[PDB]
Design a protein around this ligand. Structure first.
Ligand SMILES: Cc1c(C(=O)C(N)=O)c2c(OCC(=O)O)cccc2n1Cc1ccccc1C(F)(F)F
Ligand SMILES: [Ca+2]
Ligand SMILES: [Cl-]
Ligand SMILES: [Cl-]
Ligand SMILES: [Cl-]
Ligand SMILES: [Cl-]
Ligand SMILES: [Cl-]
Ligand code: NA
Length: 121
């Protein structure tokens, strides 16, 4: 809900249009990212991994945020909530920054088409 809301506010698209994009947007991921938007998702997965290693549960954490002219402001009772917001913010900004190359053909991309090596974090 929260990340999805952040995606919608920052990109003008439905959350669903990122949730299953390329080889990395959506649960898990493998092989080489298809484009810059997909790289945002690779980085976001790495970000969540770092949070998991710190003892957080970023897949489950609920946080608070606002969007003004100054940008995305993150908040939350716990440090783990705020960290999760920071990973999400970076991803949502990355999506916005790459709207110019977003390609509808990579939404709901068949995972069978993901080829090549898996880049490290
Ligand atoms: C873009 C994205 C994700 C990523 O950024 C990613 N790197 O995989 C993502 C996600 O990533 C965490 C993971 O890969 O384990 C899990 C579920 C939905 C996700 N979505 C889509 C999403 C996000 C919030 C609310 C709804 C949706 C959905 F799936 F409906 F589109
Ligand atoms: Ca992923
Ligand atoms: Cl690329
Ligand atoms: Cl990151
Ligand atoms: Cl707001
Ligand atoms: Cl910002
Ligand atoms: Cl397009
Ligand atoms: Na703390």
């Amino acid at each position: 809900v929260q990340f999805g809301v952040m995606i919608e506010k920052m990109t003008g698209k439905s959350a669903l249009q990122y949730g299953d994009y390329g080889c990395y947007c959506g649960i898990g991921g493998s092989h080489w990212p298809v484009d810059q938007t997909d790289w945002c998702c690779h980085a976001h997965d790495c970000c969540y991994g770092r949070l998991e290693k710190l003892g957080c549960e970023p897949k489950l954490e609920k946080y608070l945020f606002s969007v003004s002219e100054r940008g995305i402001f993150c908040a939350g009772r716990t440090t783990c909530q705020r960290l999760t917001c920071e990973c999400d913010k970076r991803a949502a900004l990355c999506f916005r920054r790459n709207l110019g190359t977003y390609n509808r053909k990579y939404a709901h991309y068949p995972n069978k088409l993901c080829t090549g090596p898996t880049p490290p974090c």
